[model samples]
Target chain A: KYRVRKNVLHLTDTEKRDFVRTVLILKEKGIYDRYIAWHGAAGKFHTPPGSDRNAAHMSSAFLPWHREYLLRFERDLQSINPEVTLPYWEWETDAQMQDPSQSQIWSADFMGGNGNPIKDFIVDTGPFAAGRWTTIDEQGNPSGGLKRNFGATKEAPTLPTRDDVLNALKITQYDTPPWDMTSQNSFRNQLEGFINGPQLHNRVHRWVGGQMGVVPTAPNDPVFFLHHANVDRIWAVWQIIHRNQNYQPMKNGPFGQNFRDPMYPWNTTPEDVMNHRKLGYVYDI
Target chain B: KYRVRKNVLHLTDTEKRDFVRTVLILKEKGIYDRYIAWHGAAGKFHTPPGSDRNAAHMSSAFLPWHREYLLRFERDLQSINPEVTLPYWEWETDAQMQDPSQSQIWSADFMGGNGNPIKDFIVDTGPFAAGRWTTIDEQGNPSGGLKRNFGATKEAPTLPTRDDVLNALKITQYDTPPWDMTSQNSFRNQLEGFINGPQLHNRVHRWVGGQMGVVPTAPNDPVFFLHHANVDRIWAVWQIIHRNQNYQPMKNGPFGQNFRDPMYPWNTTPEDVMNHRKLGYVYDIE
Candidate 1:
């Protein structure tokens, strides 16, 4: 049976501990590094052989591509601990507060706080703070410690509110042609923070700054998963609400490939992953 | 002789006075209001007949459509003063400063300052200040004077630098299929600030805030022309550097209309406007 992914805030103390432990194990085993490389490779300005830069981003492929990527990461975690499932971070609650960096999520017990001011923006506190876990830089070179300058450059001052998400849910189209960032009235574009969509996913990345802000090396921060898991959950909710409206690009073109077209490395098509239940997981909203 | 559009910052005091005077004339004659109505009509959520909502925005048409639109606006201004051309605002300089709102452009003689705090974000200074020039609201309804809350909300704190423009110039393609905001490596998307493109145009809209921040009524603010003129100049510069490539979607589709396709109201096509000289104007740069 698929396990229910709970919000990190809702996780029990023991569950949180287990989740953290599983993530750490993945990092130590270098599994986390691989995902970071994929994201980095995708962000390259030039299209690399066997890799399309910006493929997973600024496109309709954004949702399903990340969905499959998250599923694989979850499976990797489950490989070590059978009880593990990814936990999401509901950032809107923190955004509503005056100072998001001061939130409990940034506590030493959780993801941790901003980096040292005197020192480089290397995270000073938290489980994955600097001196604890090393990350792969944009160049695919491994560097010491995770970095975060909360509320730093390129950061969104606040997360999108509940109203933002509700507005996104009201978009009727899954995606239109040029299924990239500018597709309007597109739920996909809205979720991706392009168009007038709820600045949901991208704002969180910007708000996190440091590793999370850089597209290629973003997954290096474990918080990337929780952020994406929630993004995925929002898509699931949108799908249920507008189930009749199917995934777009029904014909072959730049933005549209058949629904069943294989999503690089994964044999599954967008159709395959439309139903989260089939993927052996569901969100506990 | 075609009037060469010069950067507003580069305009001489007399030239600035002429440009501002011409714009104010257009505002009084209702020509300026017509363009604002077009922009407002395009921003409508639902596509009204003859109205392509989201047109000239968030798509490949962003550049060419606006290029044509600005030319028409310039012509209107030129009708009053033959020597007057639209002035461009180089916002990056203001963005580099610690406080953008403090820049000279916001002075009472120029565009204006932020909206009054106690009021409804209405501009209280400058030529386009609230009491002087009434603007059409988002619903195509006439409303009070222009509004601007510089750096107020949904605005970028900084402007794109020279380096950013240089980086965008490196893009090889004009635009790819799905020629919208997401098109990668396309100069059109980059200049439009959709892809990794420098946040050139959108950032200005955000920085200006209030009416300028709102797309439908953005043109209502006189600064809209100067900002877009600079954006249009960047496109011209990109085209000059990459003379080998051309505006894309040479074929037809949702976003990919042929270069020769009529862009509505105007008999011109993307092909017709590709060369600014053909349009009877040039930028003073180089």
Candidate 2:
């Protein structure tokens, strides 16, 4: 009842330091790398092996998949620091800024700023700088430092707007048949940012380029959890409105995509995490 | 205490059938893929990111890591059938055969025969032939059917002789300094087949061909467990001789290789699995 995740902007300096420090401690213990590896591993695990749907993305399980991922990750963070709760990066509000890169979340004490051009876009400002933070490629080998190139991609030049999120929330249906990126009028697809091909979630990833830009390499940046926390918050918001509306394809969907099917690399299903609040945490929104 | 892992040859017809059936059941339930994926994932995960030592292979953790892997896998099989326990392949003894492919373990009743040339080397004869069993690439996508071309590699024309096993067992040290493939007079390296490059365990993988030839893809074949069971048995054999000598580099080894350090992809360490008898399973030879 006490666990409450807050907006990154609302977090105190001490809160940010505790959160960042807790993550670093977990990173040192080899626990954080396991999370990164799990993300990449889940990405590679497709629902039926050839389909667009994976255990974690591009289908009905996308929302719940990330929810469980964040849930487990949040629990790990708590184990490190009982006071630390995962904070959501409200990028939609950041879109209002003329220079979203100047957002407080990117401060030297927090998530750090955009990559340096002289250092080949390597993030050299904050705690997770060139030498301080290590990155792994899709092959799971030693890649280099944390990198960020804000608004670098032409497809996603700016952060997704608030109206974009509200518009997605307006969709009545959670997801649709075929249950993929092509699903029309699907809230999952819209919020996932495939509706207009890089609208919200996808746009944020692309805007925060470098490691964040790619799906497999995204978790290399600590911002991945914060971004996903926000995504989970958005899904939780949808859950509140669509309390009566349940997971799509309760039957007839692919094995892993089905409401009750066990997500690959884990036995936890979408049904297991359909209720975010039931998992012992609430968003401060 | 009741568990006794028998040789594949020693297994009755029912035992073989139950083993294969349990695997298929686990496969259908998606448990088998987890084991295969766990192996490949650990292989890519080097202890220090760029080192020769991974969570599973080419290091001291190789033996203990696989021991835990097979232990857990056996438990899964047991979950499906209470009577089912993993059987060792005993490749060293199988090496005596004029054609190792003719071994009873590879018969259509059990693991099935070698790959088919007419079907472009895809295994077409076994219960796990192309149509029946699905295989995945390193990327973790479905790569189509299982394949096997026995004794295909020239380096591993036949399995390692029994003398190789005897000689390796003669070594008292469990593992030595550097604690990697290059570690000299090291029992782990010798049995792991890095000694003189592809001699015992490595040669067996190479000889099996197809998916088995590559370390990452070796588990794609069902025989991977059977093969590793024998590897575990040989280590146990060594463990019996050197009651005094224990796991090497108890403290000075790398992160995952240390005696007490937890193996990646799992919390169980070498110390956690040093005693097979305590884990409630013993090789039939014991």
Candidate 3:
């Protein structure tokens, strides 16, 4: 029942500016503690403590983990101010490394020491000397505890920005309905190439500190949500673009699963995520 | 190609003890930042957080947010000691409300508030609230925000733990191959019953604080992973139990919206989560 808001609250320029500013401030003051409050109560919050390495791990491969994290964050934000809705940034718009130094929650100082000389050295050396930090080895082995220091030679790659993602979306324009259908091999190949390709995949894996390099879903990557938000946005657009094609049948095969397949999270079925309209919230692409 | 792993790290008694202890510690902490270290690294750990009135809104409905949170925790644990593979707790086996007053992360008073005063409150509040939260009003409108203070006298009724859920799963049990072409009716009837029925539906909803009530997915509920882990586990079991019905032809429906299904965390297809084995690691049922 609670899906996207049918009437998405449009933040005016002033509201948008304020919202972004608040997000920045939250990051700066690290007032994230206050925002950790629960949905109904005023002061309740859920905190699971650990170190920077833990943060990196969380940010890596488990997609469900981050999905919940964001919701908690979103819940906290809404608790503080119910009228305000969470806004997302679309990073795939500019995949050209436009802002070389730009960092996110997952970004850290991997190249050299930032300020504290010895600590910085230890941070860099620990990961390198141990050579156990990389998300996946060349062969996708867990190597969960193996640490390798690629040193300055390794710079995590970035996702294609909105423009790049848009182009990719445009590239798959010719595919028919049920885009996720396995029968649409062309659509799957093109989209997977863009997302799971070596260069891009490596960057994402490294950014999340290598947790998600193997698993298709890692909640901590930060990029996961942005990517899906964009995808959700695309779904909204596609619905409008191909309203007539909405009822296509899924391809049949011994290899295919139906909408009720149980692999989806929260005990959700394909039928659950389907039907955007009945979900009570429609996306406006 | 990073999918290879040796033996699935089976937790010893000591390991399980420590793992359960850590979960209690997390519950006690109740601060997201404090737990970020362990949670961020593993990318799996969450509990529904929202108003009681509209628990669904408060729950972690999206997928990406919890994914990152778990990774953060995993990374922290690894940093502490590389040999440590992430541990998971399967709460289903211990269904008797074993330790009603236990906390998952920190001390009972660590967060400095009266912790849930009721014994078995987590289980009780979860399912109970879930059913009521999903109940539409006279005009078919569901409640919007957390409304816990709303009297139990007037809202949707609470559900039974043992009887309701066990019954639902039993009835929903597949005939060898679950969700197979031949078992379509079996899958559909049970699934629909789970969602539409007031008993099991409410409890599952409440457990995740209503994420099931609102969104298709909610990563925030700590139970979300365990539940899905079980779901994924069931699928694996199904593969073995009903090998003949491995895959069925995809049916035509509103769900087949194209490859870009726009699921929360990975802008991928329903096909993405299909193969849990290929995703790298499997849960330890023991």
- Order of candidates by lDDT, top first? 2, 1, 3
Per-residue accuracy of model 1 over A1-285 as CA lDDT, tens digit each: 368999877887788778888888977653555566545533431111112324467766678878888888898899999898988887767778888777766767777788887777888787887777777655445567777776665437667778888898899998886666667788888888976432688887776777787766788898898899988998898998997888887755242134765443333568777878899999995
Model 2 residue A44 CA deviation (Å) reads: 1.7
lDDT of 3 by residue, A213-262 (tens): 43332321223334444444454454455454332223330111233321
The true-versus-predicted C-alpha distance at residue A242 of model 1, in Å, is: 0.2
The TM-scores of all predictions, comma-separated, are 0.48, 0.92, 0.31
Q: What is the DockQ of the complex in model 1?
A: 0.01
Q: Per-residue lDDT for B101-147 in model 3, tens only?
A: 13231122121111132532222243223332222221112333122
lDDT of each: 0.71, 0.87, 0.31
Q: Model 2 in CAPRI terms: which quality? A: medium
Candidate 2 positional error at A110, Å = 1.3
Residue pairs with backbone atoms closer than 3 Å in model 1 (clashes): A40-A216, A178-B178, B8-B88
The best candidate in terms of TM-score: 2
Over B213-241, each residue of candidate 2 has an lDDT whose tens digit, in order, gives 88777898999999999999999989989
Name the candidate, 1 or 2, with the larger TM-score value.
2
User: How far is B85's C-alpha from truth in model 3 (Å)?
Assistant: 38
